[PDB]
């Protein structure tokens, strides 16, 4: 069972800075099947990135996805008051075997 971990455990930054979140896979995960979700408290997860580099509908362009192999990256160029919430990375596929990260919190 692939294990998805996230770094850092909690990221502290001020608005307008650059945020970088890393997702690590215990094995080699296809870059076509990595997703990034943003969850504000009291809400359902919001899909930000799919295919590890594609933004969902309505997602601001300040979010970007990249990486391959075992290392994947979610980069926020300019933090905003709305960009401070939990972030999950998910490994999925065309088979019924998915995994999630443990969550990275971006705070003021």
């Amino acid at each position: 069972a692939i294990r998805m971990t996230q770094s850092p455990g909690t990221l502290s930054l001020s608005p307008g800075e650059r945020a970088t979140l890393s997702c690590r896979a215990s094995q080699s995960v296809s870059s076509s099947y990595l997703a990034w979700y943003q969850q504000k408290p009291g809400q359902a997860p919001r899909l930000l990135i799919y295919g590890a580099s594609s933004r969902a509908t309505g997602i601001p362009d300040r979010f970007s996805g990249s990486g391959s192999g075992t290392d994947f990256t979610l980069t926020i160029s300019r933090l905003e008051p709305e960009d401070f919430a939990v972030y999950y990375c998910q490994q999925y596929g065309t088979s019924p075997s998915w995994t999630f990260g443990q969550g990275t919190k971006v705070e003021i």
């Binding site: 076509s32 099947y33 580099s53 594609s54 065309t94």
Partner: protein, 49 residues
């Protein structure tokens, strides 16, 4: 009808063909348990040159 006449003379006439029609339909496909990964082709972020 085959002779196109209302009067038929003595003899033996080939009028039609006989065929045993099929009873039911049989489908035999391989035992495959995977979905084709067409998502990474039609939904890739960047197509090649």
């Amino acid at each position: 009808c085959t002779l196109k006449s209302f009067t038929v003379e003595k003899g033996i006439y080939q009028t039609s063909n006989f065929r045993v029609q099929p009873t039911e339909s049989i489908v035999r496909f391989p035992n495959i348990t995977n979905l084709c990964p067409f998502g990474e082709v039609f939904n890739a972020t960047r197509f090649a040159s």
